[PDB]
Design a protein around this nucleic acid. Structure first.
Ligand SMILES: Nc1ncnc2c1ncn2[C@@H]1O[C@H](COP(=O)(O)OP(=O)(O)OP(O)(O)=S)[C@@H](O)[C@H]1O
Length: 200
DNA sequence: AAAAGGCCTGCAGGCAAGTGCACAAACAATACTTAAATA
């Protein structure tokens, strides 16, 4: 580590060595560096916690190869996990609980997110994620708290996670005639939870 | 085998494309009125 700190340019060094198979769009790789490092927080004590994690989202077309960037990152991040928008249903991605009848206890069956705790959740096709399911993610902005009160079980399960998403303009490639945030169908109550938006 | 939690798809939630068009006013010159020139 001392070797690295001495080797200099470490910031832009990693900013280059990230995604070391693709050249260009340096800025988004910069943001990905900032995400994977994360590592801040404010448990204010005797009061409100503050998520010190990053929620960066994209926007573009297949030509951007953003799914490759996701493979890159959540391969580079320890604990990282990948998925798609429609890959896992709502209850599939958040959590599924079984009231174990043997000891009548709580079993958590690997919600994508809880698996994602202390890791970066890669997400594709976030536009088609069936906004009725956008509630779970929307829940994630309020990090490390996924509360579920159904089927005789009413308890919480925390997931320290940073979410990386990949979206598409609804009109395909892009609508020049229309303003931004039209291309980006996401209701502002989602952007405001995101920190960085990178339309490409 | 059916009744009770949960989640998937048929009905339509909806509205801009868009043409018809039924409102209006001068409209272009109607139809007729009234002063003048000639026997
Ligand atoms: N800067 C780049 N360096 C190397 N390959 C690139 C670069 N930009 C695009 N590509 C290529 O673009 C191809 C398209 O990748 P895809 O995963 O299909 O795109 P994408 O990530 O799905 O974008 P979305 O999610 O459809 S918007 C990849 O296989 C890359 O090889």
């Amino acid at each position: 580590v001392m070797e690295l700190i001495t080797s200099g340019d470490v910031y832009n060094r990693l900013a280059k060595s990230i995604a070391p198979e693709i050249y260009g769009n340096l800025d988004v790789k910069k943001a990905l560096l900032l995400l994977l490092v994360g590592g801040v927080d404010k448990r204010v004590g005797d009061g409100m916690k503050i998520r010190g994690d990053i929620n960066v989202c994209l926007m573009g077309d297949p030509g951007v190869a953003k799914s490759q960037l996701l493979k890159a990152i959540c391969k580079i991040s320890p604990r990282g996990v990948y998925t798609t928008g429609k890959g896992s249903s709502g209850v599939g991605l958040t959590a599924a609980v079984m009231k174990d009848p043997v000891t009548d206890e709580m079993i958590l069956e690997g919600g994508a997110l809880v698996l994602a705790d202390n890791g970066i959740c890669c997400i594709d096709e976030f536009d088609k994620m069936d906004e009725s399911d956008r509630t779970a993610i929307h829940e994630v902005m309020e990090q490390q708290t996924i509360s579920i009160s159904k089927a005789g079980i009413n308890t919480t399960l925390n997931a320290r996670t940073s979410i990386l998403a990949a979206a598409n303009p609804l009109y395909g490639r892009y609508n020049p005639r229309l303003s931004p945030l039209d291309n980006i169908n996401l209701p502002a109550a989602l952007l405001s939870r995101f920190d960085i938006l990178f339309l490409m």
